[PDB]
Chain A
């Protein structure tokens, strides 16, 4: 199929998120991200992985 299947603008296929806050406790490590799916870019959560 030619149309309506894939864009032609600039889109990062895979992007890496660096944590915003990271607190290494005595026996655990908590890292918080702010993943921000852009506009008109539907993201499937199955592909995410730390």
Chain B
């Protein structure tokens, strides 16, 4: 009947998490398996992924 049911305690971190960055070079590396060449600013064929 409390927040223990649906809320989890965790250690505060100033970084506010570490999302992944995706590196895309669009015109050098051939697109990976299920990526298609979209010239949208957002979507580019990723080539690698790293934490920030």
Q: How far is the CA of A25 from the CA of B39 in the complex (A)?
A: 12
Q: How far is the CA of A23 from the CA of B39 in the complex (A)?
A: 10
A residues in contact with B38, CB < 8 Å: 21
SS class, residues of chain A in contact with chain B = strand
**Interface residues of B, count at CB 8 A:** 4
Q: Which residue of A lies closest to B42 (CB)?
A: A23
**Interface residues of A, count at CB 8 A:** 5
Q: Which residue of B lies closest to A23 (CB)?
A: B40
Q: Mark A1-33, 1 if CB is under 8 A from B, else 0.
A: 000000000000000000001010100001010
B residues in contact with A21, CB < 8 Å: 38, 40
Please give the distance in Å from A22's CB to the nearest CB on chain B: 11
Q: How far is the CA of A25 from the CA of B38 in the complex (A)?
A: 15
Please give the distance in Å from A32's CB to the nearest CB on chain B: 8
> Could you write out 8 A-B pairs with CB less than 8 Å apart?
A21-B38, A21-B40, A23-B40, A23-B41, A25-B41, A30-B39, A30-B40, A32-B39
